[PDB]
Amino acid sequence: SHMSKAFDLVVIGAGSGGLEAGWNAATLYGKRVAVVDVQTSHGPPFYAALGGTCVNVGCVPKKLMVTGAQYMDHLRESAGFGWEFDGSSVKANWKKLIAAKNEAVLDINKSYEGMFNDTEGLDFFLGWGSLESKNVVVVRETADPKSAVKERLQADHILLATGSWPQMPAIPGIEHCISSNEAFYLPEPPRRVLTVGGGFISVEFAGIFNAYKPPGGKVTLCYRNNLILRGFDETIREEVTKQLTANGIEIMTNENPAKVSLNTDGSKHVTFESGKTLDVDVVMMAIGRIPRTNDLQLGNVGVKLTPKGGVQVDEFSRTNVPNIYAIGDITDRLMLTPVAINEGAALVDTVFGNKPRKTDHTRVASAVFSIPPIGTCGLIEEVAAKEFEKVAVYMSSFTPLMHNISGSKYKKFVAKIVTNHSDGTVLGVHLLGDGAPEIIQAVGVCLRLNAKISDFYNTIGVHPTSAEELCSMRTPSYYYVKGEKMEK
Amino acid sequence: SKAFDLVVIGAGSGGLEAGWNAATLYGKRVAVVDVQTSHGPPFYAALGGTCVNVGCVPKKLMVTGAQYMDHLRESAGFGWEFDGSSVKANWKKLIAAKNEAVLDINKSYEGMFNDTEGLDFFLGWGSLESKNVVVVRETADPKSAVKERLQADHILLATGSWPQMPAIPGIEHCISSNEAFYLPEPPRRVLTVGGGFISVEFAGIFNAYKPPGGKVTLCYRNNLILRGFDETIREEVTKQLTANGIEIMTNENPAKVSLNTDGSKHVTFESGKTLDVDVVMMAIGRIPRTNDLQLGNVGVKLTPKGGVQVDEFSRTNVPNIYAIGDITDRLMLTPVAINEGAALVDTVFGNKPRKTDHTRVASAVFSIPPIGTCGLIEEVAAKEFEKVAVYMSSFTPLMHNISGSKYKKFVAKIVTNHSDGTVLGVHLLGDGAPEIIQAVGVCLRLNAKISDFYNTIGVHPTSAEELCSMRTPSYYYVKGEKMEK
Ligand SMILES: Cc1cc2nc3c(=O)[nH]c(=O)nc-3n(C[C@H](O)[C@H](O)[C@H](O)COP(=O)(O)OP(=O)(O)OC[C@H]3O[C@@H](n4cnc5c(N)ncnc54)[C@H](O)[C@@H]3O)c2cc1C
Ligand SMILES: Cc1cc2nc3c(=O)[nH]c(=O)nc-3n(C[C@H](O)[C@H](O)[C@H](O)COP(=O)(O)OP(=O)(O)OC[C@H]3O[C@@H](n4cnc5c(N)ncnc54)[C@H](O)[C@@H]3O)c2cc1C
Ligand SMILES: COC(=O)CN1C(C)=Nc2ccc(Br)cc2[C@@H]1c1ccccc1
Ligand SMILES: COC(=O)CN1C(C)=Nc2ccc(Br)cc2[C@@H]1c1ccccc1
Ligand SMILES: [Cl-]
Ligand SMILES: [Cl-]
Ligand SMILES: [Cl-]
Ligand SMILES: [Cl-]
Ligand code: NA
Ligand code: NA
Ligand code: NA
Numbered sequence: 001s002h003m004s005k006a007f008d009l010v011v012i013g014a015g016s017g018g019l020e021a022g023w024n025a026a027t028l029y030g031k032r033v034a035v036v037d038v039q040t041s042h043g044p045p046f047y048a049a050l051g052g053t054c055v056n057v058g059c060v061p062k063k064l065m066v067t068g069a070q071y072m073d074h075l076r077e078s079a080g081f082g083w084e085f086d087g088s089s090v091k092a093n094w095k096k097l098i099a100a101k102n103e104a105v106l107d108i109n110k111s112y113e114g115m116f117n118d119t120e121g122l123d124f125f126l127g128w129g130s131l132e133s134k135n136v137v138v139v140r141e142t143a144d145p146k147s148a149v150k151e152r153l154q155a156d157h158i159l160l161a162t163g164s165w166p167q168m169p170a171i172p173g174i175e176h177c178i179s180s181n182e183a184f185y186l187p188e189p190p191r192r193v194l195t196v197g198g199g200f201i202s203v204e205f206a207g208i209f210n211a212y213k214p215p216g217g218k219v220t221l222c223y224r225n226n227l228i229l230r231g232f233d234e235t236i237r238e239e240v241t242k243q244l245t246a247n248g249i250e251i252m253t254n255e256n257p258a259k260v261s262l263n264t265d266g267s268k269h270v271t272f273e274s275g276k277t278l279d280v281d282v283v284m285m286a287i288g289r290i291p292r293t294n295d296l297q298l299g300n301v302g303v304k305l306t307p308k309g310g311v312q313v314d315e316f317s318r319t320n321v322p323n324i325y326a327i328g329d330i331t332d333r334l335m336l337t338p339v340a341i342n343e344g345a346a347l348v349d350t351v352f353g354n355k356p357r358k359t360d361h362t363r364v365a366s367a368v369f370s371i372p373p374i375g376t377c378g379l380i381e382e383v384a385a386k387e388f389e390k391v392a393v394y395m396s397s398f399t400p401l402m403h404n405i406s407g408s409k410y411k412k413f414v415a416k417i418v419t420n421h422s423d424g425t426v427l428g429v430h431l432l433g434d435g436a437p438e439i440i441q442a443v444g445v446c447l448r449l450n451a452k453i454s455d456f457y458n459t460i461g462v463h464p465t466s467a468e469e470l471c472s473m474r475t476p477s478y479y480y481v482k483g484e485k486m487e488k
Numbered sequence: 489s490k491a492f493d494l495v496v497i498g499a500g501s502g503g504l505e506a507g508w509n510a511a512t513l514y515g516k517r518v519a520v521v522d523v524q525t526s527h528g529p530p531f532y533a534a535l536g537g538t539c540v541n542v543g544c545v546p547k548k549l550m551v552t553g554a555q556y557m558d559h560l561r562e563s564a565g566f567g568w569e570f571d572g573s574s575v576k577a578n579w580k581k582l583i584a585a586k587n588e589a590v591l592d593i594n595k596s597y598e599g600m601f602n603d604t605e606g607l608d609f610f611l612g613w614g615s616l617e618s619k620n621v622v623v624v625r626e627t628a629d630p631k632s633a634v635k636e637r638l639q640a641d642h643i644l645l646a647t648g649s650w651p652q653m654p655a656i657p658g659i660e661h662c663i664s665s666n667e668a669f670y671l672p673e674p675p676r677r678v679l680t681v682g683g684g685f686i687s688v689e690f691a692g693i694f695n696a697y698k699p700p701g702g703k704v705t706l707c708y709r710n711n712l713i714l715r716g717f718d719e720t721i722r723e724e725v726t727k728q729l730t731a732n733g734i735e736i737m738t739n740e741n742p743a744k745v746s747l748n749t750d751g752s753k754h755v756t757f758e759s760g761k762t763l764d765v766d767v768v769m770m771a772i773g774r775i776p777r778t779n780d781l782q783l784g785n786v787g788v789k790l791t792p793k794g795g796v797q798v799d800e801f802s803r804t805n806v807p808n809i810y811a812i813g814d815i816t817d818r819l820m821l822t823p824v825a826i827n828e829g830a831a832l833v834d835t836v837f838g839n840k841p842r843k844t845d846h847t848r849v850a851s852a853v854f855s856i857p858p859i860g861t862c863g864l865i866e867e868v869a870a871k872e873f874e875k876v877a878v879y880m881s882s883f884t885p886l887m888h889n890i891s892g893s894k895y896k897k898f899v900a901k902i903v904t905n906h907s908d909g910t911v912l913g914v915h916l917l918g919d920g921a922p923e924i925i926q927a928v929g930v931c932l933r934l935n936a937k938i939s940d941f942y943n944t945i946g947v948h949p950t951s952a953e954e955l956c957s958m959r960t961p962s963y964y965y966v967k968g969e970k971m972e973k
Contacts, residue, residue, distance in 0.1 A: 054948070060886070063949045067887050068566035074559045075568070081553030082581030082697075083560070089571040096567030100890050338946045338953070365947045375947070401545070402552045405585050435923035441952030442927030444944040449934040459930040461823035462850045462860070464544045467926030468823065 003154075008352075010034040010137045010155035012129040012296065015052020017328035017340030018161030019112070021348045026122040029352035033122050034153050036129035036139050041109035042102070047181040050109050050124065053163050053329070054337040057184050060108065061101045062204060066369040068097045069211035073247075073371060077406035092212045094189035101184075125151060130297040131158070134321060143295045157323045157351060160296065160303075160311055161344065164329035167288040173260030176268055177283045180205065190282035191217045194270060196257055197286035198223030198230065200368045203240070205284060206249050207371040220278060222252035224287075229368070233380050233430035235395070235414050240370055240432060246410040247371060257283075291330045308332055315358045317347045325351070333361055365444035367437035372411060375440030378428030378447055384418050385480035392421035393480075394453065394473035400433070400466060415469045417453060421479060424452040429470070439467045491639030493837075495622050496520040496646060497614035497781070500537025502813035502825030503646030504597070509830050511607035514837040518607040519638050521614040521624055526594040527587070532666040535609070538648050538814070539822040540593050542669050546586050547689055550669075551854045553582045554696035558732070558856065562891035577697045579674035586669070610636060615782035616643070619806060628780045642808050642836060645788070645796055646829065647781060649814035652773035658745035661753055662768040665690060675766040676702045679755055681742060682771035683708035683715060685853040688725070690769060692856040695734050704734045705763060709741040714853070718865050718915035720880070724899055725855055725917060731895040732856065742768075776817050793817055800843045802832045810836075819846055850929035852922035857896060860925030863913035863932050866903050870965035875906035877961035879938065881954045885918070900954040902938060906964065909937040914955070924952045 009025050011018040014037030025031040039049035042056035049056050075090060116124045127139040127150045137155050141147035166179035180201050189212040195202040198221070206221045213219060221228070221244070228251065229237040241251055258273045260283055270278045291310035298305070304320045306312045310332030317325045325347055328340035339359065346357040365377035384391045394417040403411045413433030419426050429443045446455070453473075461468035478487040493516035496503040503520060511518040524534030527541035534541050560575060601609040612624040612635045622643065624636040651664035663671075665686055674697040680687045687706060695704045706713070706729075713736065714722040726736055740761060745768055746754045756762045776795040783790070789797045789805045795817025802810045812828035814820050824844065831842035850862040869876045879902035888896040898918030904911055914928045931940070938959075946953030963972045 059949050064566075064887065064890060067890075071559070071563040071566055071568045074556065075563065075570075078553075078556040078559065080585060081549070081556060082578035082585065083553075083556050084574075084576045084578050084581075085560075086571045086574040089569075089574065091569045093567035093569055100565060100567065104886060104890060336945075337948045342945050360943075360945070364945050367947050367950070401589060402549060405549060405589060435920055437947055437950050438920040438952050439923045439927060441924065441947050441950060441955060442931055444947070444956070445931050445936060445941055446927055446934065448944045449931065449936060449940055451930060451934055455930055455933055459926075459933050460821075460827055460845075460849050462852050462922055462926050462929070463539070463822045464548045465852070465922050465926060467923045470926065471930070 004136075004152045005034070006154045007032050007034045007156070009157045009159060010036070010129075010153050011159035011161055012036050012137065013052065013161040013163060013328075014050045014112075014124065015048065015161060015163050015328065015340070016054045016337045017344040018159060019052065019344075020341045021159055021161065021327065021344030022122055023119075024345055024348040025352050026119055029348070031121060031352060034125055034137070034155065035116075035122070036125045036127060036137070038126070038128055040113060040124075040126055042105045044185060047184070048163065050112050055108050056105055057181055059337055061105055061184060062208075063369055064101045064104065065097065065208045066204065066371070069208050070371060072211040073408065077408055080406040092189070094212045095187070097212065098185070125153070127151075128295055130295060131300045131303075134301045134323065145297060157325070159344075159347070160319075160324065160326040160330055161328050161340070162292045162296065162330050164289040164335060165292045166285060167290045168285055169257075169287065171257060171259055174285075176260040176262055177285045179285050183284055186282065189213055189217075190280070191215065192220070192280040193282040193284060194220045194222060194268075194278060194280045195284040195286055196222055197288070198225065198228030198253075199286065199288070200229075202284070202286040203228060203244070203368060203370050205286065206244065207247070210247060210249050219249045220252060220280070221249060222255045222257070222272070224254070224256040226253050228253070231380070232368075232374060232376065233416055234382070235397075235416065236374055236430055236432045239397075239412055239414050240374065243372065243410060243412070244370065289329065289335060291332050293330065306332060316350055316356070317343060317359075334364055336364065336366060339364060363444065363447040365440050367440065369437070372433045373436045375431045375436035375438070376429065377440050377443050378426070379418060380428060380430065381418050381480065384420075384427050385483055385485075388420050388422070388427070389482055390421035391427070391480040392419045392453070392476035393417070393478055394419070394475070395477040396469050396473055413466050413469070415466075415473070417456060417470065417473060419453045419476075421476070424454055426451050426453055426456065433466055435466055439470075443470075489637055489639060490519070492519045492641065493517045494519070494642050494644065495638050495640035496644040497622060498522060498537070498644075498646035498648060498813075499535045499597075499609065500533070500646050500648050500813060500825065501539050501822045502829035503644055504537065505826045506644055506646065506812065506829035506833055507607055508600075508604070509833040510837055511604060514833070515606065516837055519610055519622075519640070520607070521610045521612065521622070521638075523611070523613055525598060525611060527590045529670060532669070533648065535594055536597050540597075541590060542666050544822055545593070546590055546669055547693070548854060549586050549589060550582060550693050551689060551856070554693045555856060557696035558893070562893060565890040565892050577674070579697045580672070582697070583670070610638070612636070613780060614647070615780065616785050616788070616809075617782075619643075619786050619809065630780070630782055643810070644832070645781065645804070645809065645811035645815050646813045646825070647777045647815055649774040649817075649820060650777045651770060652775045653770055654772060656742060656744050658747065661745045661747050662770045664770050668769050671767070674698060677752075677765040678704050678767045678769065679763065679765045680704070680706045680769045680771060682706075682773075683710065683713040684771060684773070685714075685855075686771035687769070688713065688729075688853060688855045690771065691734050692729065692732075695732065695856075705737055705765070706734060707737040707740045707742070707757075709739070711738055713738070716865070717853070717859060717861060718901060719867070720882070720901060721859055721899055721915055721917045724897055725857075725859065728857060728895055728897070729855070774814065774820060776815050778815065791817070801835055801841065802828055802844075819849060821849065821851060824849065848929065848932045850925045852925065854922065857918050858921050860916040860921035860923070861914070862925050862928050863911070864903055865913060865915065866965065869903050869905075869912050870968060870970070873905050873907070873912070874967050876965040877904040877906040877938075878902070878963050878965075879904065879958040879960075880962035881958060885951065898951050898954070900951070900958075902941065902955070902958060904938045904961070906961070909939055911936045911938055911941065918951055920951055924955070928955075
């Protein structure tokens with residue numbers, strides 16, 4: 001006999017949260033830390049890898065792809081500013097985009113491999129981790145619990161940071177579908193695609209495919225309810241629909257796939273609940289992400305799950321079992337890279353540092369890299385209204401000037417500030433238009449600072465920008481007093 | 489004769505706000521005077537002011553059109569394929585395009601005049617006849633035909649500013665930005681003389697629209713362009729403009745310009761260096777526009793510098809004459825004039841004294857790539873506070889690894905008061921900087937601490953988020969001296 005490798009902390013999942021935790025504990029509390037993940041670089045079969053979802057199959061590569069997409073707009077829009085070239089000569093090369101995105105992701109993988117190798121107290125382990133018991137973490141050959149054990153890891157504390165995975169509805173033909181995962185690796189651009197879901201990934205991939213589809217190509221997005229983007233400011237959801245339609249993407253609302261069968265030429269025949277049908281080369285299922293709890297064998301130690309099925313955790317990320325924590329998408333709060341980063345740091349502060357700290361989950365700034373994009377932070381009006389007696393809304397939506405010249409007149413900029421009209425505290429900011437995501441960041445700081453609308457208007461404009469619009473609104477566009485919209 | 493509550497000389501940023509606010513929010517009767525109704529030669533500025541006619545609005549659009557130079561090329565990295573050899577930058581098309589945008593705002597501003605009760609527009613040149621009387625002559629010549637005398641309870645000087653033309657031999661062969669907005673064809677060779685934003689912004693505009701064998705040279709008399717801006721940013725913007733083909737001549741200054749028979753220009757510098765160019769633009773400064781105002785008649789006092797003298801409340805030495813905007817010669821910014829012009833009206837036709845706050849004012853340079861800035865630069869803060877800390881981040885973003893523009897570093901710097909952690913200045917370079925900085929302005933109004941920044945959760949992926957992920961200073965200034973203690 002001989003000893004198992006021993007750690008202060010073992011983290012399952014080398015992603016947005018786990019990596020911040022592992023890093024913080026190794027470089028700032030002098031701890032020995034094990035991080036398990038299922039591949040060392042991006043791609044099939046498991047897509048996520050060293051770096052996590054954000055890095056291999058999320059924020060980073062999609063943003064490249066959305067930048068890739070924006071050139072369709074750019075090239076068209078430049079004629080207005082006098083640019084001339086052979087429009088007939090223009091083709092959008094997917095192969096070449098993917099190959100770019102790929103090796104860029106690979107550099108991030110390779111770069112984090114090197115940082116493990118270079119950081120004393122931080123080691124990586126390739127495989128599937130699970131819980132044999134409350135202080136033992138087994139790393140196995142595959143997700144199957146009968147796969148050969150690779151190593152047993154003795155751990156004082158255990159960090160569950162496995163993230164989330166696409167939710168695939170049980171319908172006939174679901175095997176004929178794909179997910180965000182596979183989208184990143186289509187070998188050639190789909191000609192007709194249907195993205196299923198009215199959420200941020202679907203809306204996003206739609207514009208991507210929209211830009212890179214060949215010939216008489218068509219992109220259809222569908223949503224089970226009236227209006228895409230549940231959770232976002234309601235003017236934005238409408239504007240963004242009209243703008244997605246304008247770039248030639250079509251929206252199916254109050255529609256939901258019920259089955260998919262294969263056509264004899266390999267294409268996809270989709271029947272919705274309503275009897276309706278649609279033929280596409282690809283069906284991208286993007287209807288929700290579910291916490292990834294199944295391979296962890298949490299039964300072995302009895303970690304309680306919420307009804308929705310995420311790892312239940314207190315405001316400090318602790319499970320019903322001492323020394324086991326969870327952060328990030330597996331917890332089913334806000335599914336965002338920076339919330340997982342801020343969650344892991346805080347956990348490590350709490351447990352290894354002198355300074356206990358908990359993640360603030362309100363007033364989190366976020367974006368949607370649609371074309372144009374949304375930038376948002378804080379409460380939307382319909383929520384604000386329920387919880388505050390008097391709520392004011394300030395609004396503005398010129399179609400901006402450059403887009404009068406550029407040809408895309410359909411490209412509005414909406415800006416919205418939602419306030420507690422009783423003292424003027426800004427509860428929420430909601431934007432759609434070019435630069436929206438870049439603008440919203442400091443608004444985050446503003447909110448954490450309890451900024452009042454008076455603080456917004458009293459600050460002096462930067463001209464000429466779209467952001468200056470936010471310091472020009474002084475008169476409310478309308479209100480809500482106890483629950484009810486009014487206007488005066 | 490005609491007579492009024494408020495008479496405004498200059499239908500510009502400051503004055504048209506002043507006007508409208510007095511005329512609509514207070515029911516007062518108002519005159520506004522300008523020399524032209526729409527944009528362009530001969531007077532360039534016109535109804536709408538500098539910013540609309542020959543300022544922010546037109547340059548923004550032209551810079552937006554320059555950027556497509558960068559855009560068209562960077563599209564390749566993302567797999568866009570097209571015939572590169574068929575690419576032409578059509579200047580006349582952009583100028584025509586810019587001209588209708590500007591023309592339209594003019595027209596609708598004249599639309600606001602004919603729609604609005606008790607605010608009237610007057611064509612011609614304004615001048616102080618008497619402390620209650622404004623003459624509108626037909627031209628700047630103070631001996632020309634009177635068109636109106638306007639009886640003026642209160643008077644407003646908002647005639648803006650004008651390009652400074654140094655009195656060197658053959659100065660007459662140079663243009664300023666005014667003419668630059670109207671050039672019939674894009675120069676093959678251009679010298680922009682000046683280190684400030686107007687010179688820089690135009691440098692890059694001509695750089696994109698230059699015909700095939702062309703070259704944009706910029707000169708500054710001192711060592712580094714953009715005095716007043718963050719130094720890391722000045723040095724970077726310099727390296728990045730160089731990589732995009734614009735030559736920066738530092739430590740050089742024109743002593744004269746003489747005209748060649750083919751129309752071009754022979755620029756001779758103090759150093760004895762010479763360079764031949766198609767156009768010489770002069771953007772070395774902008775002066776108060778007070779020559780034509782006939783101020784002598786009442787003795788409104790100007791300073792040593794030449795701007796009308798004013799207190800915190802825009803008031804001149806002469807009771808009931810006031811001055812806002814560029815004419816006063818502080819912050820030369822459209823939104824500032826607009827703030828000045830409206831606090832004025834509130835402090836004069838209402839409840840509360842209101843003073844425009846000149847500090848911590850966010851601003852931008854629309855260079856390629858753009859700067860956005862707010863609050864103090866580090867050297868100035870090391871002279872007022874005892875422990876200054878500098879927070880720094882300078883990666884070349886990934887989209888630019890893929891793009892081909894590996895030289896496109898994003899710079900993000902926070903200057904702090906290290907004793908309490910108050911942020912005093914935030915300086916940005918890179919795509920988006922002018923948009924990012926706006927809400928930083930608000931922060932700086934709410935007393936933001938460096939920790940108020942790191943504690944806010946970032947939006948990913950954005951450049952902005954870098955402002956929210958700096959916790960350890962890169963270096964310091966201790967009681968004057970720079971170090972990493
Ligand atoms: C398509 C897409 C686009 C997105 N775009 C954005 C965006 O633009 N901005 C933004 O803020 N957020 C975005 N997100 C969200 C962001 O990716 C996630 O919120 C974040 O990556 C998850 O945080 P996490 O800590 O839970 O780590 P994760 O990265 O999700 O998980 C880490 C790792 O756990 C591993 N793992 C799973 N099971 C095991 C096993 N038991 N053993 C070992 N390892 C295991 C996985 O391989 C993975 O590498 C996007 C997400 C997706 C899917
Ligand atoms: C190239 C350039 C780019 C610029 N870019 C920006 C920018 O991006 N952002 C920014 O904030 N600022 C910018 N500015 C500066 C901004 O334009 C000015 O600060 C602003 O317009 C000043 O407003 P004002 O009220 O003082 O008067 P102005 O807007 O300058 O208007 C003064 C008016 O007075 C009129 N006038 C002059 N003499 C008389 C007379 N005797 N009788 C009657 N009328 C008269 C003029 O015709 C003019 O319309 C830029 C300026 C230039 C030159
Ligand atoms: C240069 O600093 C780093 O790149 C190290 N990292 C830090 C500080 N936090 C992370 C958060 C999320 C991810 Br995904 C990656 C990091 C990286 C990192 C690299 C290697 C091992 C752990 C963390
Ligand atoms: C279209 O904007 C308006 O509602 C009227 N304006 C206001 C409120 N402020 C201005 C500040 C600077 C300038 Br330049 C222009 C305006 C316009 C305006 C237009 C015409 C006459 C007076 C004011
Ligand atoms: Cl292709
Ligand atoms: Cl759905
Ligand atoms: Cl041309
Ligand atoms: Cl100079
Ligand atoms: Na190591
Ligand atoms: Na303002
Ligand atoms: Na942060």
